[PDB]
Amino acid sequence: RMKXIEDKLXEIXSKXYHXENELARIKKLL
Amino acid sequence: RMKXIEDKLXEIXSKXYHXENELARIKKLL
Amino acid sequence: RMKXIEDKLXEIXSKXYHXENELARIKKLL
Amino acid sequence: RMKXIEDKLXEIXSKXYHXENELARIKKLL
Amino acid sequence: RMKXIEDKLXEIXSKXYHXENELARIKKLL
Amino acid sequence: RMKXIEDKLXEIXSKXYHXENELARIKKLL
Amino acid sequence: RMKXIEDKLXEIXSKXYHXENELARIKKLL
Amino acid sequence: RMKXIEDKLXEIXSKXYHXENELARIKKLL
Numbered sequence: 001r002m003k004x005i006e007d008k009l010x011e012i013x014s015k016x017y018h019x020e021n022e023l024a025r026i027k028k029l030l
Numbered sequence: 031r032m033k034x035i036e037d038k039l040x041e042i043x044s045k046x047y048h049x050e051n052e053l054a055r056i057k058k059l060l
Numbered sequence: 061r062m063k064x065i066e067d068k069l070x071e072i073x074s075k076x077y078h079x080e081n082e083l084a085r086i087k088k089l090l
Numbered sequence: 091r092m093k094x095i096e097d098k099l100x101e102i103x104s105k106x107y108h109x110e111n112e113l114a115r116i117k118k119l120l
Numbered sequence: 121r122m123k124x125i126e127d128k129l130x131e132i133x134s135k136x137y138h139x140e141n142e143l144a145r146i147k148k149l150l
Numbered sequence: 151r152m153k154x155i156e157d158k159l160x161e162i163x164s165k166x167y168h169x170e171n172e173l174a175r176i177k178k179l180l
Numbered sequence: 181r182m183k184x185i186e187d188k189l190x191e192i193x194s195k196x197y198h199x200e201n202e203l204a205r206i207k208k209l210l
Numbered sequence: 211r212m213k214x215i216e217d218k219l220x221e222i223x224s225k226x227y228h229x230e231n232e233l234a235r236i237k238k239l240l
Contacts, residue, residue, distance in 0.1 A: 001032045002032070002091045002092070002095070005032070005035060005036060005039065005095060006095060006098070008036070008039040008042075008043060009039070009095065009098040009099070009102070011043060011046070012039070012042060012043075012046055012098075012102060013098060013101060013102075015046035015049055016046075016101070016102055016105035016106075018049070018050075019049065019105055019108070019109065019112075020108075020112065022049075022050065022053055022054075023053075023112055023113075023115065023116070024112075025053065025057050026053070026056060026057060026060065026116060027115050027116060027119070029057070029060040029181055029211060029212055030060070030116065030119040030120070030181030030182050030212070031062045032062070035062070035065060035066060035069065038066070038069040038072075038073060039069070041073060041076070042069070042072060042073075042076055045076035045079055046076075048079070048080075049079065052079075052080065052083055052084075053083075055083065055087050056083070056086060056087060056090065059087070059090040059151060059152055059211055060090070060152070060211030060212050061092045062092070065092070065095060065096060065099065068096070068099040068102075068103060069099070071103060071106070072099070072102060072103075072106055075106035075109055076106075078109070078110075079109065082109075082110065082113055082114075083113075085113065085117050086113070086116060086117060086120065089117070089120040089121060089122055089151055090120070090122070090151030090152050119121055119181060119182055120121030120122050120182070121182055122151055122152075122155070122182075125155060125182070125185060125186055125189065126155055126158065128186065128189040128192075128193060129155065129158040129159070129162075129189070131193055131196070132158075132162060132189075132192060132193070132196055133158060133161055133162070135196035135199055136161070136162055136165035138199070138200075139165055139168070139169065139172075139199065140168075140172065142199075142200065142203060142204075143172060143173075143175060143176065143203075144172075145203060145207050146176060146203065146206060146207060146210065147175050147176060147179065149207065149210040150176065150179040150180065150210065152211055152212075152215070155215060156215055156218065159215065159218040159219070159222075162218075162222060163218060163221055163222070166221070166222055166225035169225055169228070169229065169232075170228075170232065173232060173233075173235060173236065174232075176236060177235050177236060177239065180236065180239040180240065181212055182212075185212070185215060185216055185219065188216065188219040188222075188223060189219070191223055191226070192219075192222060192223070192226055195226035195229055198229070198230075199229065202229075202230065202233060202234075203233075205233060205237050206233065206236060206237060206240065209237065209240040210240065
């Protein structure tokens with residue numbers, strides 16, 4: 001319950017890595 | 031409570047799909 | 061506790077609106 | 091448990107700052 | 121950025137008028 | 151944006167034909 | 181990217197001076 | 211996108227050589 005939430009919020013804090021690095025793909029095209 | 035949180039964190043893990051695919055719209059313009 | 065989490069996950073599901081509309085700012089420059 | 095979730099949802103509401111300001115990097119290149 | 125590029129490409133499409141008319145100067149010396 | 155830039159760069163690569171052929175006007179007056 | 185494009189569009193707006201002055205070469209041979 | 215724009219701006223900076231040398235054709239007819 002709480003732990004398998006905290007280990008989703010694991011996944012989001014990966015998505016907010018791939019936000020950053022796949023923005024930084026775009027910024028470094030521009 | 032916990033379940034209807036986990037099935038929001040469903041929605042975010044959709045938003046972090048549409049992050050990716052609607053970045054990949056931009057990258058593939060550039 | 062749970063409710064004042066669910067009404068943050070309110071805020072994120074606003075941030076994932078302003079993700080979309082402030083991407084769609086960029087796409088519609090390009 | 092709940093508090094150390096709420097202080098992750100701290101981190102996301104930082105990532106959704108750096109979403110905004112590192113989009114606004116791109117928009118202000120364009 | 122993009123708008124103040126496309127409005128240089130304004131200036132070039134003036135240079136490619138003044139190309140033309142200041143050749144049409146020479147052609148009408150000849 | 152990008153497409154309606156690249157399709158100006160269409161127009162310039164016409165101006166750089168009409169550069170050429172309306173010089174080849176002068177060269178064949180001479 | 182965009183800056184090192186706009187500073188090519190620098191070079192072209194030099195070529196469209198040296199267009200002009202090296203025509204004004206010919207016009208003043210004629 | 212950006213790369214296949216900058217490598218048109220390649221082609222124009224060839225047209226602005228062949229501007230030059232095929233004027234330097236005329237100047238050396240005169």
